[PDB]
Amino acid sequence: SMSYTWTGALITPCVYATTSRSASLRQKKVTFDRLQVLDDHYRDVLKEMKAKASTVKAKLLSVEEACKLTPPHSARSKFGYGAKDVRNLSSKAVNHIRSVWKDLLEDTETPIDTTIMAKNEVFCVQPEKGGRKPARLIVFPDLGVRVCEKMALYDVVSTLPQAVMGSSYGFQYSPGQRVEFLVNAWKAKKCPMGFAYDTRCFDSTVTENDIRVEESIYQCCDLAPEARQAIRSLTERLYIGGPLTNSKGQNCGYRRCRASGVLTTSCGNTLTCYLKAAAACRAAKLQDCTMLVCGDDLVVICESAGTQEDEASLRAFTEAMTRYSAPPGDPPKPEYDLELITSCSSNVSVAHDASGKRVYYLTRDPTTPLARAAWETARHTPVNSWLGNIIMYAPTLWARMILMTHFFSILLAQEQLEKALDCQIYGACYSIEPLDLPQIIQRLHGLSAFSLHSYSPGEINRVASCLRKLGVPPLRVWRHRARSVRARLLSQGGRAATCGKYLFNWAVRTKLKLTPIPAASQLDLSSWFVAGYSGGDIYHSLSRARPRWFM
Ligand SMILES: O=C(O)/C=C/c1ccc(NC(=O)C2(NC(=O)c3ccc4c(C5CCCCC5)c5n(c4c3)CC(=O)Nc3ccccc3-5)CCCC2)cc1
Ligand SMILES: NC(=O)COc1ccc2c(c1)S(=O)(=O)N=C(c1c(O)c3cc(F)ccc3n(CCC3CC3)c1=O)N2
């Protein structure tokens, strides 16, 4: 079947930013008939996944619990209420949500409407390879439906992926735990070989059968009968496909592939990619495979069979993925150093802590983080990518010297150190106070994140070259700026002083011997790094448990 069919009605509007103007170019790329051929490897892997899914017991979320996960600025309903009404449990919001639920239980077939829009994302104007990337397409149902999806499937999509894929499920790891997993897998092999597999437009490649196979896995859970019916109806009426409406309310077309903005997108894509890849590893005869899967992002570490043999096994893996309707974007290439593999737009690098001991950490090319940060300093944005980058990339040279210095100087100038900001981590929205960053960083990366040094030449050069290319002052300027930022933070005391002392410890000549922040243990990070919710419309406000008077 065709991934999409179009009426011709335009996908209407809401360093460069992707707009609604480039939507036509994206539509051409993602529109095609899918040819899927399944085999015994696929069937064997599915049965193994199902046996693991069978250990899961999932609970039905109440209307109140589902309402509480809704982001404050989530798209309003076309039925007379918005995200504020949902979070307040308003009479109108709650009555409509209950009617949507009742309809899911009563109607098992009518396709549910969705809205289609072009994603506005900032990329760097780099005239080195081709040109500007076309806008990605976002497909999502109405607010009432999104609350119902949480009631039925929030517990499933939060628990089932780890139960099925075990250590291969990537969203259970913080960046440091992801690094630890990759390093351990690499060291376990006699002669390691690793590769990333890029699927061309993964959402478009997902077939009706893929979605039903994904539902057959959900159905292995112990579920409340209404949750079981809701999952069955949501599968047929929403997940499998349905009509597309643009922002103007015009019939835009029809979808028969994965919608980006439903609660099951991340879980479903991860399960689908894992199933196809594990089956393709068997068809390719790759020895002792370790897979790490995050949605459509796949990395495989295995036992090398020699240079020519590895190139041949990779082409066999690709042919098998292609049959399963997961063809490649960039062709996969075997890598023989862990540091050279790019997965989840990141690579492993090594540094030393204050005692000269090796510390592996996760980094990336800083061009896109710096460009996006520049866009965000220039104009007000709902989500602050700089904040998420400081959190996830806290041990890196560039996040510490440039992002921390620049944004802390802006917060000091605006007196907004205590103002909570939104950032996206694994598709979920978190409301975080920048004053909590030293405690968050210690919890996720450890005390060593504040004293790393002896960065690799390759890492230092990538950073320095990127600054030159973007017209950013050199690293020596950032050291001078950080010394002043640090001094002003120290003067303020409390959490602000901890920001100065811990985040800017690298900027001082003498360098302090840092002790653990006592209040860090109080942070409730239980919802962090459990699952991916990309396009799932999930929100959390960072909270503190058992606070001590003197902290
Ligand atoms: O050789 C030496 O010894 C010293 C050299 C030297 C060179 C340049 C400066 N620049 C500055 O003082 C100014 N800009 C900056 O001090 C500046 C700060 C951050 C900048 C950023 C990002 C960095 C990441 C956080 C957000 C801001 C970008 N650009 C920046 C410029 C350059 C810029 O203009 N825009 C972009 C565009 C895309 C990406 C990055 C940038 C402020 C007043 C005059 C211009 C200072 C010293
Ligand atoms: N195709 C589908 O359906 C979704 O497929 C997906 C594939 C990968 C991801 C997602 C969806 S996500 O939207 O859930 N977010 C991330 C992600 C982040 O949130 C993230 C946030 C930051 F501020 C900084 C770095 C981040 N990094 C890199 C560092 C990390 C440790 C690995 C991610 O990868 N990964």
UniProtKB/Swiss-Prot annotation:
How the cofactor is bound: the record states: Binds 2 magnesium ion that constitute a dinuclear catalytic metal center.
| Cofactor(s) listed | Mg(2+)
Post-translational events: The N-terminus is phosphorylated by host PRK2/PKN2.
Localisation per UniProt entry: Host cytoplasm; Host endoplasmic reticulum membrane
Q: What does this protein do?
A: RNA-dependent RNA polymerase that performs primer-template recognition and RNA synthesis during viral replication. Initiates RNA transcription/replication at a flavin adenine dinucleotide (FAD), resulting in a 5'- FAD cap on viral RNAs. In this way, recognition of viral 5' RNA by host pattern recognition receptors can be bypassed, thereby evading activation of antiviral pathways.
Stated membrane topology is:
Single-pass type IV membrane protein
Regulation (activators, inhibitors): Activity is up-regulated by PRK2/PKN2-mediated phosphorylation.
Where does the record place the modification Phosphoserine?
20
- Indicate what this protein is called per its UniProt record: RNA-directed RNA polymerase
| Binding residue positions for Mg(2+) 2 | 198, 296-297
Q: Which reaction does it catalyse?
A: RNA(n) + a ribonucleoside 5'-triphosphate = RNA(n+1) + diphosphate
Q: Which residues form the RdRp catalytic domain?
A: 192-310
